Amino acid sequence: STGSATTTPIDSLDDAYITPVQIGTPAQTLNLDFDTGSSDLWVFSSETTASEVDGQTIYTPSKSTTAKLLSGATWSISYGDGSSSSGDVYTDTVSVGGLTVTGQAVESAKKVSSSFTEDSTIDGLLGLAFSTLNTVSPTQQKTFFDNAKASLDSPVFTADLGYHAPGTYNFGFIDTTAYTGSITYTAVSTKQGFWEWTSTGYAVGSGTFKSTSIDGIADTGTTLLYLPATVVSAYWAQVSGAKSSSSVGGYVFPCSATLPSFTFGVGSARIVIPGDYIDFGPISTGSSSCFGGIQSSAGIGINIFGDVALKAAFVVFNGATTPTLGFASK
């Protein structure tokens, strides 16, 4: 089997991407944030505290003839941005782009933190990291991809995120028309539960490539590119007037600037992020200070190849017995 679904930016900055997902019988379609940095499929629901729902579409398990309470199971998750959610668990039929999994754990939110409530466009998350990170207790549950894998034509999914435009998540096949050149594959460590790999270096604009190992994660659920402070300083030093602002929470730059590109290495190959992809617009409405799309990871504990980086590439998440990542230009 295969599946193919379009993923759409939630706003004009590509702050996140939503993908329609069918849950239950008859189908209830919710727009989920596919997140290769976590491993829970959770949804706003008829069980979510009413004051914490503000415009989201909810899953109502009592209206699904295939929903079953997973008795005794609870979940609770905290994300790197400080947001969180928790609740109980149903199993139900879940389909993405024509690919159907029966018995998928659907984690129903009883509580969500303010940033989820405040984002009316995201009805939940669909985790695509390794199932060892799944938070369901006392019986850990598998991701949608893990459940689908054996049925897929090939044990892979691909992320093809657009810049200010829709893109595609494919399951079970590699669309050879969706990229240019060849795909360069690179080793993955699953020791932390992430799609963790080592970039071979970087360049700023037309500058020379610096060969240096940068361990980080391919994370579709993180907006920006978070890299070591040395690398980030070297980038922003090429933008007149750019500075790190403790009050804003990162590097800002004059909105009048033209940003240089940023290149990252994948083995001997190179992925070029155009400068425009690094512009996240005014820090507040009407400001002439703009927020940068490349930020320091120093306070995180891990480097994160988020959407800013991934949207410059066609990315293969190879879930073979030994997982690997592939990157191609497009």
From Swiss-Prot:
Q: List the disulfide bonds.
A: C255-C290
Residue ranges annotated for the Peptidase A1 domain, each copy included: 17-328
Q: Which reaction does it catalyse?
A: Hydrolysis of proteins with specificity similar to that of pepsin A, prefers hydrophobic residues at P1 and P1', but does not cleave 14-Ala-|-Leu-15 in the B chain of insulin or Z-Glu-Tyr. Clots milk
Cite the EC number: 3.4.23.22
Top-level taxon of origin: Eukaryota
Keyword Signal set for record: yes
- Mind listing the UniProt keywords for this protein, alphabetically? Aspartyl protease, Disulfide bond, Hydrolase, Protease, Signal, Zymogen
Enzyme class label: hydrolase
According to UniProt, the name of this protein is Endothiapepsin
> Which species is this record about?
Cryphonectria parasitica (Chestnut blight fungus)
Upper classification of the organism:
Eukaryota, Fungi, Dikarya, Ascomycota, Pezizomycotina
Which part of the complete sequence is present? 90 to 419 of 419
